[PDB]
Amino acid sequence: MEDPYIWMENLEDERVLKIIEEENKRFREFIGELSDKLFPEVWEQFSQPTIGMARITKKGIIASYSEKDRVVIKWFNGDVIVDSKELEREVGDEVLLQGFTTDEEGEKLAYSFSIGGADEGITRIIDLKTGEVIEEIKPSIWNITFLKDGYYFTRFYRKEKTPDGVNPPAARMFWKDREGERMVFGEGLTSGYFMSIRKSSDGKFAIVTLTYGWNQGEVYIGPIDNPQEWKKVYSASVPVEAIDVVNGKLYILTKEGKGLGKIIAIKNGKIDEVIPEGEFPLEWAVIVRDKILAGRLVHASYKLEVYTLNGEKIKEITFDVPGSLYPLDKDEERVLLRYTSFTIPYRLYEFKDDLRLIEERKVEGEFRVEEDFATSKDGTKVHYFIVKGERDEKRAWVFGYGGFNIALTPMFFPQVIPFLKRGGTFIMANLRGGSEYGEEWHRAGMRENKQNVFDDFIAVLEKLKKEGYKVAAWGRCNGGLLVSATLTQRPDVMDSALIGYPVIDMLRFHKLYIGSVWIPEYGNPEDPKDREFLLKYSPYHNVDPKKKYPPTLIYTGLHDDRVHPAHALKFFMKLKEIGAPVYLRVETKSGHMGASPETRARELTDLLAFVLKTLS
Ligand SMILES: [Cl-]
Numbered sequence: 306m307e308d309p310y311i312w313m314e315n316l317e318d319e320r321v322l323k324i325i326e327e328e329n330k331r332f333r334e335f336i337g338e339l340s341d342k343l344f345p346e347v348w349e350q351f352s353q354p355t356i357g358m359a360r361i362t363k364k365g366i367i368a369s370y371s372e373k374d375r376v377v378i379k380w381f382n383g384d385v386i387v388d389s390k391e392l393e394r395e396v397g398d399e400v401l402l403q404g405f406t407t408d409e410e411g412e413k414l415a416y417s418f419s420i421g422g423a424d425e426g427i428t429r430i431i432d433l434k435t436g437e438v439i440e441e442i443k444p445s446i447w448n449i450t451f452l453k454d455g456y457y458f459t460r461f462y463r464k465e466k467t468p469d470g471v472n473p474p475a476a477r478m479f480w481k482d483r484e485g486e487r488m489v490f491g492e493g494l495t496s497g498y499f500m501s502i503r504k505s506s507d508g509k510f511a512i513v514t515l516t517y518g519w520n521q522g523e524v525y526i527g528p529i530d531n532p533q534e535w536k537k538v539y540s541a542s543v544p545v546e547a548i549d550v551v552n553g554k555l556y557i558l559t560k561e562g563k564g565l566g567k568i569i570a571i572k573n574g575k576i577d578e579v580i581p582e583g584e585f586p587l588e589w590a591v592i593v594r595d596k597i598l599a600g601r602l603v604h605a606s607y608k609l610e611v612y613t614l615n616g617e618k619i620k621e622i623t624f625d626v627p628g629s630l631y632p633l634d635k636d637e638e639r640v641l642l643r644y645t646s647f648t649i650p651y652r653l654y655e656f657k658d659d660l661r662l663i664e665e666r667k668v669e670g671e672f673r674v675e676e677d678f679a680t681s682k683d684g685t686k687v688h689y690f691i692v693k694g695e696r697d698e699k700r701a702w703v704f705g706y707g708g709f710n711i712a713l714t715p716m717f718f719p720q721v722i723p724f725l726k727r728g729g730t731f732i733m734a735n736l737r738g739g740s741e742y743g744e745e746w747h748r749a750g751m752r753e754n755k756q757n758v759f760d761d762f763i764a765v766l767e768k769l770k771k772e773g774y775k776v777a778a779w780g781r782c783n784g785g786l787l788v789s790a791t792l793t794q795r796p797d798v799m800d801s802a803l804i805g806y807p808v809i810d811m812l813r814f815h816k817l818y819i820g821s822v823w824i825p826e827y828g829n830p831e832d833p834k835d836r837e838f839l840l841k842y843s844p845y846h847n848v849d850p851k852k853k854y855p856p857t858l859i860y861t862g863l864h865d866d867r868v869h870p871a872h873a874l875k876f877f878m879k880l881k882e883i884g885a886p887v888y889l890r891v892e893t894k895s896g897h898m899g900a901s902p903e904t905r906a907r908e909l910t911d912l913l914a915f916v917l918k919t920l921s
C-alpha cells in the first residue's frame with residue numbers, strides 16, 4: 306500500500322541528490338587513497354588488447370580489438386581498417402564502436418558506432434580496398450547480410466511504430482539495393498517478437514529465427530533470393546537455434562525435452578534426432594566440413610565435441626585451463642572460436658580439421674584454477690571455480706549471479722589479478738537460475754524458486770567460511786539482488802558485501818524503467834500469490850533491525866537507464882535506518898553504462914579497494 310521512500314524514485318529530488326553527494330564523499334574518504342594506489346595495476350590489466358568480433362573473408366580474417374581508450378577493426382595479419390580515434394577526429398566528439406560484419410569475399414565492410422552517448426547510432430558500409438564509405442545509414446542498422454549487390458538488414462523500433470503500424474518494441478527485416486529499400490520480413494509481429502537472419506553455409510538458403518521474449522521461437526528457411534518463399538519449417542516453445550541447412554536438412558539445436566540441448570534435423574516436414582540429449586548441456590553447435598562441431602558445457606566450462614553429420618561422435622577436445630568457448634564466425638571450410646578464462650583475456654582458435662591456436666593473450670604469474678562443490682539445503686551440488694595466487698592470505702572474493710538462463714563460465718576480471726597477487730582467492734559460484742545444467746536448472750531459480758539461488762550461494766559462502774576464509778560476496782544486477790538478499794538473511798556468512806546496480810524492491814521492480822521485462826523471471830507483484838513468495842525474500846522488505854551487518858557497498862550509476870538506481874537508494878536507506886556500516890557509490894558519468902574505459906576501470910578499482918580494506 307505505502308512505500309515510505311517512494312520519493313527516491315524521482316532521481317531529480319534534491320533529497321536524493323544530497324544523498325548521492327554525501328555518500329560519494331563518504332566512500333571516497335574510505336577507499337580513495339587506496340584506490341589511487343591500485344588504479345595503475347588495474348588499468349594495466351584493463352587496458353590489455355582484447356579481441357571482440359572476428360569475421361572470415363576470402364582475403365583473410367578481419368577482427369576488432371579493444372585497447373586502452375581505443376577500438377580498432379583490422380586485418381588479422383595486416384592494416385587497421387577502422388580506428389576509434391580517427392573517427393573521434395572526424396566528429397571531434399567521443400565515439401563508441403559497436404560491431405561489424407563483412408561480405409564473404411571481403412570487399413565490403415559494415416560497422417556501427419554511436420557519436421557521443423547519443424541514442425542514435427550510425428552505420429557505415431565501406432569498400433575494403435579504398436577505405437571509401439560507399440554508404441552511411443542513420444540510424445544504425447543491424448543484421449547486415451550481404452547478398453550480391455544489396456543486403457538484408459533488421460531495424461529495431463524503440464520509440465516509433467514500425468512501417469506496417471505496430472507499436473514498439475518491435476523489429477523488422479528489410480532489403481536494400483541501388484534501387485532502394487523494402488520491408489521483406491516481419492509484418493504483423495506484435496511487440497516482443499525479435500528476429501535475425503543468417504545464411505546457410507553454402508549461402509543459397511536464408512535462415513530466419515523468430516523469438517518472443519527470451520524464451521521461445523520459430524524457424525523460417527528458404528531461398529536467399531526470395532523472402533516471399535521463406536516458409537516456416539519449425540515451431541518450438543523453448544529456446545532453439547538453427548545451425549545450418551546442409552544438403553536439404555535444417556539442423557537445429559533445441560532445448561526441447563528435458564532442456565539440456567539436442568540436435569535435430571528437419572527435411573520436408575520430417576523430424577529426426579541427430580544428436581540426443583546428453584548428461585551435460587549442449588550450448589552451441591556449428592557445421593564445418595561434413596562434421597558437426599559442438600560446445601558441451603561440462604560443469605560450467607567448455608569442452609569441444611566433433612560429430613559426423615549423422616550424429617556420430619568422432620572425438621572430443623579438452624583444455625588445460627577451464628574456459629569459455631564461443632564461435633566467432635564460420636564458413637564452409639572453417640570456424641573461428643573465442644576462448645577466455647580467469648587469467649586468460651582471450652585465445653583465438655581456428656578449427657578446420659583440427660583445433661589450432663592462432664592468437665593468445667594471457668597474464669603470466671603463478672595462478673591456479675581449481676574446482677569444488679558446495680551442498681545446498683535440498684542437497685543440490687553447487688559447483689564453483691577457484692582462482693588462487695602464489696600465496697593464500699585466506700580471503701575470498703565470491704562472485705555470483707544465478708538467474709535469467711545465464712551461465713557463469715570462466716571469464717576475465719582485470720581487477721581480480723592484483724587481488725590474486727596480493728594472496729587473494731577468486732570464487733565463481735554456479736547457482737541455480739542460470740543454464741549450467743539445462744532448462745530446469747534455470748526454472749529451479751525462477752519465481753517461487755528464487756530462494757534456491759540464495760540457498761545455493763549461502764552454501765558456498767558458509768563452506769568457504771568453514772575453511773577459514775574471510776569472505777566478500779559480490780554480484781551485479783540480478784547478482785546485486787543475490788547479494789542483498791543473502792545479506793539480509795545470513796549476514797554471518799560474509800565479512801563484506803558488494804552490491805552492484807541491483808534490483809532491490811521486488812514489489813515495485815516492474816514499474817521502473819524496463820523492469821517489467823523481468824516478470825517472467827521473478828513473478829508479478831500485481832498478483833497477491835506472487836507477492837507472497839516475493840515478500841519472503843525481498844531485500845527492501847527484509848532488513849532485520851536486530852541483526853548486525855558487515856561492511857556493505859552498494860554501487861550504481863545515476864544515468865543507468867536499465868536498472869533504476871532507486872533500488873540502490875532504497876536499500877541503502879533501509880540499512881542506514883538500522884545503523885549498518887553501509888556505503889553508497891553512484892557513478893556520475895552518463896550515456897552508455899561504460900562511460901569510457903577509464904571511468905569503468907576506476908570503479909572496478911574501488912571494488913577491489915573495498916574488498917582489500919574490509920577483508921584485512
Ligand atoms: Cl561491476
Ligand SMILES: [Cl-]
Pocket residue numbers: 709782783
Ligand atoms: Cl537481468
Ligand SMILES: [Cl-]
Pocket residue numbers: 862898899905908
Ligand atoms: Cl559500470
